[PDB]
Design an enzyme around this catalytic site. Structure first.
Site, PDB file in Angstrom:
ATOM      1  N   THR A  66       0.764  -1.401  -0.210  1.00 28.37           N
ATOM      2  CA  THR A  66       0.036  -0.166  -0.046  1.00 28.37           C
ATOM      3  C   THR A  66       0.901   1.331   0.093  1.00 28.37           C
ATOM      4  O   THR A  66       1.848   1.285   0.624  1.00 28.37           O
ATOM      5  CB  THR A  66      -1.021   0.225   1.353  1.00 28.37           C
ATOM      6  OG1 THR A  66      -0.222  -0.072   2.591  1.00 28.37           O
ATOM      7  CG2 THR A  66      -1.776  -1.159   1.116  1.00 28.37           C
ATOM      8  N   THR A  67       0.211   2.173  -0.557  1.00 27.34           N
ATOM      9  CA  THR A  67       1.076   3.467  -0.488  1.00 27.34           C
ATOM     10  C   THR A  67      -0.016   4.660  -0.935  1.00 27.34           C
ATOM     11  O   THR A  67      -0.869   4.405  -1.892  1.00 27.34           O
ATOM     12  CB  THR A  67       2.044   3.512  -1.525  1.00 27.34           C
ATOM     13  OG1 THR A  67       2.983   2.431  -1.396  1.00 27.34           O
ATOM     14  CG2 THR A  67       2.980   4.904  -1.605  1.00 27.34           C
TER      15      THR A  67
END
Lengths: 4, 222, 215, 215, 4, 215, 222, 4, 215, 222, 4
Positions: J1-2
């Protein structure tokens, strides 16, 4: 008492 | 830390050093470890600094509180009991490392003979207490050296002043053989603190007298 | 009205106090002497409270008896917390009065009781015996010589006023007390002393053959 | 009616206040002086409250005594939480008034008491003595010179009005106070001072031979 | 009683 | 009947409000000005509530004082939960009214009080001062220019009606307020301002020599 | 982190650096660690950032709350006590790693001599406190280097400004010998923060003054 | 009061 | 008698409802329109309850305001437990009625309030606006066209009966509602809509310059 | 995730990828991680998917609830505080593995200068927060690569659209160097999601715009 | 009211  | 107390004819004297450490590090050069809890009792406390100052404060409050409610101080026996109950209450925290041991000096006004109304009382971590009767007591890391010094020096005690000198010397030997106990700092002018109790109550010895006694000892040993 | 009700309550209490056996307590050389007119052998109106503190009462037995128990209770706990020589007749006398006043104000019926708390000095010490009388409302009075409780108190109080002598021996004070109490027979008498000469527990009953010999 | 009941309550309280021993408190050079007409040797109407705060009362002993205890209680806890020099006569005077008013409104009988809280300055400081009078309803009044409580207050208050002198010594203020109180004998007098010169605890009783010598 |  | 009882309660409350010292609050150039007729030096009728919110009251001191404390309490907790600039004079004015109404309906005696909550703008912002008056029942009124509380409000309100001037300086508004209040002496005056120019805490008392110089 | 505080004739000064790390990673280049808790006291807090900012905020709230209720600020003694009680309250979490230690600087308006009304107070994790009397104190990972710097530089302190310069220099040496303490960033223009307290209250030193002092030090060392 |  | 008391209570409630500002709610092309006669700028009688559910009231502000809060409370929790589109005007209308009836039976004074709960359809859906009126006892009535609350409802209800037109625009429905309400000035008017065209939150106030332009 | 967020003159933009994994296994190809919590704030949450979606939902509820009760939204400061308190509340579960970290983007309507009313706020697991002032922030497993990309690309940001392109590119590099972050799937047509906030509120960027930007980047790198 |  002490009404004010 | 090291706190000595000794009876002399007509009174009691109680003296304590000034150092406070954390490990090998000297953290306080002027702590006062002997309090005047009331007009006839002084209390020294060795051990964790927080727990110590708190004990002293709260005990003084309680003595004086009962005195205000009942119009008369407790007997020396009642005082001994309350101090013992406080000490017993700190036992759980003392096993966790927050140990504080009190040494209680008092002058019993109700005793029969005034010349031996002096009183010294020692406590363990479990709240048990013992009324000392060989004339002197001490507490703290230097206590063994202090007691072994007073055992020899105690025949010299004949009044308030000689008793004071013997106290200061015992402290000097404690510090001489243990690193956690501070001796008289001649450079900064910081000397042990002392309290004298006799028929007239409890007074703090003014610093000059302790300074002269310490300088006399130091010159005697050179 | 409330004031009228209060007056009625006082009258009722007075009546209750009046119809009761008489008790006397007086100072003598060896301490304090309690002499009560008591027919029963099980029910008692004189009691030890603490080492040097005694107690006599007159009125309704269950209530005065109940106070007896409350007083015993307070002293033991106090002594354990501080010490035996710290409990005094004064503190106990005070507790009963406050309790009685509060209790009367909040309860239904006032305790038809009259109390006398007595104290003597400890062993090897000199001090005058102290007598306190606590009445049903909470009032407390300091008596120098003797207390008379229950029944008609005037004739007994006057006879004692003429016969009393400080430092009377045990036998003389017993004669004076029984005589003024009559204003009786060997049977139905409850006699006890607060003997100041005992080492610790000063209260001591005087019953049976020894009492008969004395009288 | 409720208003009528309130008036009746006030009258009852006034009557209770009226039938009582008189107490006076006045400022003098060394602090404040309490002089009360008190026959008993055990029951007292003047008391230490905190280091520099004293207390006198007139009325019903159990109640005024009870306030005495409540006041002692509040100060110690407050001091422990913050400090001794933080407790002032003003805060204490205030607490009693609020408590009294609430208590009267919710209770059954009003406290037939009249209170005077006194305060002096600390050691090595200059400040005028403060006297407060708290009445049974909760009213509080700031007095510059003297307070008179209980009994018939008019003659004593007037005699003090003529005799009062600021910075009178201890002996003169004692003579003035006993004289105006008479408007007596060495026995049955309760005298204490709030001596501003003491290092910490200012309250100090003056009893016995020394008092006799002074008078 | 006990007025004071 | 219940309606009759309610009418009686209202009359009693009105009487209580009437027999009291008068307070005025008015808008001036630098914020809001409170001027009250107050003889005591310890008992106050004007108070800071929050950074920019002030408070004046007239009636029974213990009660209005009690509301003072409740109001102080609510603001601090609210600010801690959200923030200082979120507490407004409006929210506080509202809380008192609801509390008063509920309290009166469930209590015994109604609070013989009259409240005025004042608010000014923050630092470096422009906004008109807001005055709210809360009466004993819970009613709340939004005032554009001035509020008069306690005693006989008609003559003071009219004198202010003739003398009021928006953007009057501090000295002029003080003269107008004291003059309309007279409808006095340097002593026994309680004067404070909500100075809009202060960075954070706007409330500021004006006492002593500076006040004398101003007047 | 490192926060120094030193008395000068007539006042007290308190300065703190700006870095905040997570392990070896520089996470904050402009944190403010010295707060003005009230008109006469500033508080620095070293340690866990959350616990620190929370302590400062809540303590300021409590001081001001009592002030609003009683109409008069606590004495410096009462303030010391409340801060100590907060610190003692965080002890359980400090053993779990969330330790926060405060250093409290104040100017006692009630002290007798105005020239020595400055006050510095230090706390340990167990709530005990100590009134510093050798003229200076510090807290944080760089505290030892900062103290050893001030011991030598302290004879130069004669007024508010010289005391400020000594503070900034002590910080510079802390940062010079410890990596968790940030020095003056000349590139981004971020300098230590400072608060000065004297007879007239507490004011933040405006950034320009700290910038000039820092540039003077940096040029002196080249 | 405060009807609404 | 109890029946007589109940009749008296009903009369009192009716009187309370009668002496109040009038509110109207009517259906128009874009949803529902609330128009109330309200002088204050802070105190409001029209409120959002949920996404598509609005609320108007007439009576005693603290009480109707209190119901406002209770209604807001119930919807949020219900939505969180199930979902937003599950809360309907019907469920809310029902809750108030039951609560009011129980509350009246067990409380002291009945809530002198009259409620109107309004609902419109969601975005991109067709459904007729629903109006419910809840009275002080718990009665609930389903209205097809308009609700009139508080004050004298007859003339306003009749004027609306002649002027009402389904699918009237916003301006026409505003003219009809203000006209029938008069049976006024730009100031002191509280106007809001449940605009069915909004995506989620349908409630929207119409205040100030835009309102002036419309009127 | 980012999840990246960056200010541009006049507004703020916030974008997030779409992958969700369990270990090495790709479990969700179209998760939406950026929510519009209100008309002026968007919230991204990295970490445990359950805790994340719950945080977002509950926070939106609370903002809007206070708004309905008081008739006015909280200030940006109050919003920051409530989010922080939620995050601090999840700390016990975050130590047990259920960690969720939020990144909060908002447009302050009350700020003085409209061109810099954009706001980015970052949180740690212990509830402490920090107002970012170097213009951009990111959270998640790819956050370091995303930040190191934006540091270089950020001088190109001049408006809403260029800022959007920079966001998408930063995401592309995060995914390029980390396997837990999904890049633009050209086969299935799934692209990052984006929210733009300016003076007029918060709107979701329609997918087509993100598709074109992603295709431009991908062709630039070939 | 509301009989049913």
């Amino acid at each position: 008492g002490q009404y004010l | 830390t090291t706190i000595v107390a000794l009876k002399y004819p007509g009174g009691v004297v109680m003296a304590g050093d000034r150092r406070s450490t954390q490990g090998n590090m000297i953290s306080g050069r002027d702590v006062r470890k002997v309090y005047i809890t009331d007009d006839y009792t002084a209390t020294g406390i060795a051990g964790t600094a927080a727990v110590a100052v708190e004990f002293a404060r709260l005990y003084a409050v309680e003595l004086e509180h009962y005195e205000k409610l009942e119009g008369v101080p407790l007997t020396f026996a009642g005082k001994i009991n309350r101090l013992a109950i406080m000490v017993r209450g700190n036992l759980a925290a003392a096993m966790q490392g927050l140990l504080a041991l009190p040494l209680l000096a008092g002058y019993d006004i109700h005793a029969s003979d005034p010349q031996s109304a002096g009183r010294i009382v020692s406590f363990d971590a479990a709240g048990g207490w013992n009324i000392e009767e060989e004339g002197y007591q001490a507490v703290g890391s230097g206590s063994l050296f202090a007691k072994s010094s007073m055992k020899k020096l105690y025949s010299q005690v004949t009044d308030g002043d000689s008793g004071l000198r013997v106290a200061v010397e015992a402290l000097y030997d404690a510090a001489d053989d243990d690193s956690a106990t501070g001796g008289p700092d001649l450079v900064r002018g910081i000397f042990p603190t002392a309290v004298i109790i006799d028929a007239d109550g409890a007074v703090d010895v003014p610093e000059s007298r302790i300074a002269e006694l310490a300088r006399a000892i130091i010159e005697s040993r050179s | 009205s409330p004031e009228q009700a209060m007056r009625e309550r006082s009258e009722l209490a007075r009546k209750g106090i009046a119809r009761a056996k008489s008790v006397v307590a007086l100072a003598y050389a060896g301490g304090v002497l309690f002499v009560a007119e008591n027919p029963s052998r099980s029910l008692q109106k004189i009691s030890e409270l603490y080492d040097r503190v005694g107690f006599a009462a007159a009125g309704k037995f269950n209530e005065f008896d109940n106070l007896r128990r409350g007083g015993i209770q307070f002293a033991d706990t106090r002594g354990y917390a501080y010490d035996r020589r710290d409990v005094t007749g004064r503190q106990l006398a005070n507790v009963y009065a406050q309790t009685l006043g509060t209790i009367f104000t909040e309860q239904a019926k006032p305790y038809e009781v009259e109390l006398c708390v007595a104290e003597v000095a400890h062993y090897g010490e000199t001090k005058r015996p102290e007598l306190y009388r606590i009445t049903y409302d909470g009032s407390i009075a300091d008596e120098p010589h003797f207390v008379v409780m229950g029944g008609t108190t005037e004739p007994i109080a006057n006879a004692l006023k003429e016969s009393y002598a400080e430092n009377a021996s045990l036998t003389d004070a017993l004669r004076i007390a029984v005589a003024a109490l009559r204003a009786l027979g060997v049977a139905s008498l409850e006699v006890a002393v607060l003997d100041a000469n005992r080492p610790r527990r000063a209260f001591r009953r005087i019953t049976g053959s020894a009492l008969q010999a004395l009288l």
